[PDB]
Design a protein around this ligand. Structure first.
Ligand SMILES: COc1cc2c(cc1NS(=O)(=O)c1ccc(C#N)cc1)c(C)cc(=O)n2C
Length: 112
């Protein structure tokens, strides 16, 4: 029963957020093989594959918690990376574009 309007809204919204990540930079966890110090800085890694995992395990009880996980993708990236990096620039753009997606989707999560 992923067939409830709240859960269909989260699935839709997650798709729309991944669409804004045009480089697929945030599609999967930051790889510790390529990035060995990541956990020295970042206490709670997050990425869209993890969010999708969470969604399907009914771990998102409300829209707030879903939105907090998206914000972690962005805030982690801005925290870890220098300003002059593809990653940081991507996160700034994702914050801007994804904030708008979330604005609209929250409107619908209220109506429930
Ligand atoms: C999911 O792949 C990554 C995501 C990353 C980071 C690194 C990777 N992987 S990587 O180190 O293999 C890599 C290095 C350079 C580019 C470019 N351009 C892309 C990936 C790094 C270094 C930081 C980061 O915030 N994110 C989101």
């Amino acid at each position: 029963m992923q067939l409830t309007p709240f859960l269909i809204l989260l699935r839709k919204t997650l798709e729309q957020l991944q669409e804004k990540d045009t480089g697929n930079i945030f599609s999967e966890p930051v790889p510790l093989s390529e990035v060995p110090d990541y956990l020295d800085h970042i206490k709670k890694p997050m990425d869209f594959f993890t969010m999708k995992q969470n969604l399907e395990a009914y771990r998102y009880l409300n829209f707030d918690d879903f939105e907090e996980d998206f914000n972690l993708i962005v805030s982690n990236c801005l925290k870890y990376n220098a300003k002059d990096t593809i990653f940081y620039r991507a996160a700034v753009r994702l914050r801007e574009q994804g904030g708008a997606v979330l604005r609209q989707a929250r409107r619908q999560a209220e109506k429930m």
